[PDB]
RNA sequence: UUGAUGUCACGGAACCUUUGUUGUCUUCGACAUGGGUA
RNA sequence: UACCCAUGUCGAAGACAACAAAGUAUUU
């Protein structure tokens, strides 16, 4: 891999006002540290960085607290996006490694939201076997809820945090746990938003339909686009709506 | 204005070294990439690859040497009934080297001149007679000088070197650095500048691990390894191997009843009953600043 | 309730929360865990209450109630009977001294060293002096106002701290405070969290379970077994105090600092060994009707006492590290330390079994025989030799509780389960154990090891070096054995280090699908290294103990110095020394010990072949023991094993050319005088490689072996013995003998390494390996108007 | 500070993996100090 | 704001750099 060389290339290009530059620099430095912690074969690289005063000045500027902490959330969000794109081309082992890399890197509302979504997706990988659910599935969903509640304690209108909280609450119910408290109130806020962001939301608006006995949002579902991979699941939601 | 690391080419500085560039490197103390500012951009030189560094274990092991025969001492012991202890010899003052002599001034003209080596000579005969190497006056006890028990010439030792994952050219140049050539010697131990410590090494045997259950005699392959070593030096440096020649001239052992006189000057010629110049006279005569680094880097250049 | 209903600040005022785990039988690794508070009975032995009875209740109901209360023998998880300041001030002062004198870099070392003083206040008088025998040591005389040495001497002489327990408490609190101050300098105390698997798991009972009536019969007997469990190795029952950060791995202790053998561990080990006997794992989950497998039915009759030791000295602290196989150096972050309990501690042991069979079931008789033969492997860290016990002085008898006379006698005495009743019951127990019928051999076998070294040896401990009177930079490992309440020191080679060496020897010469076993990650892996030595997913099948030295040698100290390649003198701060154990060809060091190997490994010819190959290479001298083998320490003369029936040990078994004549010419003039030294000017080009040869295997095409050499003196040689600078006595005039080891004239390996390294550096045109880069030169001005003095202005 | 016709929690080993290790010749010569006289 | 030197004495280095805990599959 030679991650030291990658750090040189980024340090040549990078300027501190530019998101992509800092995203790339943070990514390269994290990969270097990861290879050290793994005792990888890349640890045989004994070389250092060239142009020492320039490299020192640029690294010293990057490691400013606000610069690196800013870059952290953006790198996490970029990885989370690229995961949710390539999720269905990956095998289980490498889906797992991707998500756990995101979690370890991120361990600001952008960071918390990204970490909550990463924990939600890590939990989805576990599947029940026989009449037993893995404990780590419940653990992951509870940690997602815990992260979501930092945002919602100070901004109850935040749609993404609210939706992640509601998804995790529905998975808790699926595992045979109870709903967490104030599920009804938060599920009522979601209906005050009233728009489908992703396929999971269709299952929330049906829960709202069955609870408040309100039919307004069913026409959104019946008009949803058919160009989806999990067509059978969408058709099952269509049947419930009808 | 400069730290001494800036008075030599950056290529000859240690591979894994200290921060000499202008700045306060402690600003990155919390993060792993700080180490990359302390390492050469192109990696490890041969001696670092063979003998190792703080971040890379070495590939050779040096064992203790043991004397083979009954000792032959420089001076007979106080009790003639005991041959296993020798008598004392008193050395003249041992003082620290001064780099300000080799680097005469703040002018950027003056570099680090090179690697120090001590020459071979017999001033130990004067010390055995109890006299100072330069002045010839009797040495006196002081809190600052030493008395030692010293072996004579002709004592023999044996020791072993273990090695692992060497290239053939590496083993060839290691054998070359051990045995040298007939007419050359190493220096070892205390008081090298007073003529003590000339030693010669000879290989007795090389054995090789073929695998976990077979070892084999390697004596037959020694010439091939030496050939590859010298071919490697040609590949790196082509014809311009002058540093080898200067090294050999400093490793040369005087033979044929030759008797070089080797000593440091006195501080002033009035202090020397032989009548040669001291440092205070030399520093504006032969070893004047514009001439000093050339004379010091030319083997066996006389000062008087 | 407690009598008088007193109040406390909270649960932590009365007890400690401890993790209790569940171990998967086949992998040997924990599946999950839960937590509870434990409250010690010596602090809170008693609760009191009332039963209120209506007058119309019959006499027979009253009799049944009273007999039931006497028969009830356990509640809230405990066997029972039913009847009817300085350290803060010192830390602040020492921190002020350190920061006033700009010596804060030593905070961590001081914190660890002061913690080490907790075992005896007399150690304060023993703290090292400087090399001149004077109070200017670089740690203890900082501040030379008062010094640290004076602060500690005053504290040790404070009458409140004269009690050993108070001194231990003082040292521990002070060490923790200095540790936390040292952590601030590194950016604060921060510890990496686990991604997932960090939550407790509680068993869920089943509410749809069906009701059953079961007879079990009137035949019912109780067997009592009494004895001792004796520590034949050091042992480790892990338990972390969350408020104690300084130590990474910690031992379980009572509140008054006695060592504890907990009930939970003993039950877990009994269940494990019973499944080993029957040779069938139990698969049952928590909750639902009780499991009916043969192990669970026995465990439902068993009772065991929680036990503690009379011995209460502080634990040892062991250093531990991990080596990166590619570079041959410590891996990033892999330095940690461990508390260990000494061998020789004795625990009371009492077991009881209730059942309808005529005695102990045959499986339990076999397991107790295994324990009596010294294969009670009870504690954690088994792979590195911790936790082997022998059951000693066993006695037993069976009481028949179907007999009404016996049963009334039993009820009258609460089953003889209190201290006084126990001392009566012991008068009627019979010596020995009941012999098993269907006996099965123990699953582990002992291999005896003996190693011979013809060189010095060190297994370094710098913290012990910081407090020992001798005052070198590093000294060798020692450990302590308990006798009564006395502690005796023994020089040893750590079990962990020896395991590491053997594991490396095995891994470097085997492959899986053409990849060395050193390079694998070992996820979903079935390689022989996982099979023998274990992994992060399953326990290993070979257990290494510490090795001890025969005939108790005494350490020797050697001096060292690094030489600047330009000046030819001592490099600025790099003068140092060590204290290895002396070993030589005439008087070699002898190491003895043993390791335990599971019998299914000895039965497998392939695994035996692998171990044999590795120990053959250790016997050949390719793997030195301990540190600093670059300068000649740790060299194995031979290694031999006994006990395998030769299943492992079956595998363990042209003149040099003339040197050329030199071409060098030097011409000497008889009247001239020459300088004692000259400088070799290097070539401009240094040849570097970004990625040197890795240590993780013997690479094909490269060479490995030994060079044997002859050295001859041409002029007189001085190699001094600097351990004594006054040898020729009839600041003073110093004098030295020639270097000797066990009265043999020798040259150290470090001298030869440095000598040859200088010439090799010059021949290959290498960098100046040793060189004082950061020195700043300066020169005197001269009395010269034009060139100097007219440029300096007021 | 329980609630009562129903508690196998003595129903659960803080267990598992990690080499206090890597690098270093007990060496060795010119240097200190600040004026003085017109 | 030009010129000129004068005196002979003396031990140094005594550990430094790195790591300071990290990991611990539930499945096409
Ligand atoms: Zn180098
Ligand atoms: Zn069972
Ligand atoms: Zn494996």
PDB file of C-alpha atoms in Angstrom, chain C residues 70 81 137 144 572 607:
ATOM      1  CA  UNK C  70     -33.055 -24.834  60.281  1.00  0.00           C
ATOM      2  CA  UNK C  81     -27.345 -19.935  59.430  1.00  0.00           C
ATOM      3  CA  UNK C 137      20.596  10.407  42.062  1.00  0.00           C
ATOM      4  CA  UNK C 144      18.147  19.327  45.581  1.00  0.00           C
ATOM      5  CA  UNK C 572      26.729  13.232  24.904  1.00  0.00           C
ATOM      6  CA  UNK C 607       1.637 -31.211  15.708  1.00  0.00           C
TER       7      UNK C 607
END
